[PDB]
Amino acid sequence: SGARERTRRAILDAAMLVLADHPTAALGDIAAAAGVGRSTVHRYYPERTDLLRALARHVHDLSNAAIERADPTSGPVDAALRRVVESQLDLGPIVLFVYYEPSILADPELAAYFDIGDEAIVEVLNRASPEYPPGWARRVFWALMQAGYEAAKDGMPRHQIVDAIMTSLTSGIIT
Amino acid sequence: RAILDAAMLVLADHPTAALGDIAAAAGVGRSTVHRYYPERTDLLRALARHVHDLSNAAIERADPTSGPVDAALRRVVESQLDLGPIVLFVYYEPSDEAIVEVLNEYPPGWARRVFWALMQAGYEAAKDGMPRHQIVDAIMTSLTSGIITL
Incomplete structure (x- = not known):
């Protein structure tokens, strides 16, 4: 039954x-x-419909555990943001389906079905925020997490990606 | 066509x-x-060739090696923004060097991934109703200095 749950997951x-x-x-x-x-x-x-329903619950469970373990609201905002980045990178393809900013390839109706929000992350970004339009930081954050996921899929080490996202977030890429 | x-x-x-x-x-x-x-993959193939041609032509027209780099960056950003999200679609589907020029310690390819991430944010804001000039400004500043402090 330990094996069974492993097979399910x-x-x-x-x-x-x-x-x-x-x-x-x-x-x-x-x-x-x-x-x-x-x-x-x-x-x-x-039935494929049984699979989809179970998948949504599993995605919710993973995201829930990730955000609770990231503890975004406590301590220095720099360390908290890094924990958030690490936690989302470990969610893998889930980051492609975030409701507010889905990946270009994500079927919009699949994203709507999963219904993956991001308030705790919005709040950490706010804690760390010159004059960007409403929602811009949030959009950039998710676009960068998706870029990081693709980089990992394309063979790059997780540690380098986390560091890369953090520097891009705080400094950008050119001078 | x-x-x-x-x-x-x-x-x-x-x-x-x-x-x-x-x-x-x-x-x-x-x-x-x-x-x-x-087959659907056949159509995607032809679309990608065409969109790649358009994207490349747009970048070359922007002449990234000309004038002040700031102004050049803006022309590049604008030209990709105006092509719309289809530009990313063909470039991400599981089925450009010049940008690295106008851009030039990050891992190889990371800077271009960040450029396209910011373009993605831009396409989404456009869909949301955000004005074009405002989007171009936000992308430029993000590239130059990031979005957060500390």
Whole structure:
């Protein structure tokens, strides 16, 4: 049953990666991304609709644990922001679906379905904020997290990416 | 062509849209589209070539090596902004050196990833109703000095 929960979570994490790159989550794609048999996916999720509902709950659970562990409201804002960046990078493709600023590739209706908000993060950004328009910092933050996710997907070390996002946030890239 | 026109318009906001939606927006039959682009990946291919050509032509026209770098950066930003989000669509879908010039301790390729992140923020703000000149200003300042302090 420890193995069983591991299998479930592996299928859900696999489905999230597939959905990032494909409108629909075909059974072949999901089973291959999970590294389990097609019949095993069907065992856990008879219908694709059962899988989607379970995926949304899993995404919510991951995001909830991440934000609680980041503890964005306590302590020096520089350290708090770094914990936030680290926490979101570890969520992987979830950052592509954030409601306020979805990735260009995210199916808008999938983003609406997942309904992933960002108030605690908005508040940490505010704590650290010259005269940018309403919502701009929030948009840049999520665009940069998505860039960081893609960089990691493209083979770059997580530590370098976190540092890169932090410097870009505080200093930009050119002088 | 009007099919690729429709594609640019449609895919920009609905990236996972189906061939039939593109046909409708172009004013051609779903029968016609599947004839010139038998698979969705075929259409994406042609669109990407075309959009890449447009993006490259825009950057070259902006002449990033000309005049003050600040003004040059703005011309580059503006020209990509005016092309719209389809520019990112073709460049991110799982299926430019000159920018590194106008830009020149970050990991390799990171600076260009940041440029395109800021463009993404810009396309989204545009959709939200934010004025074009304001968006260009925000991108420029973000590139130069980041968005937060400390």
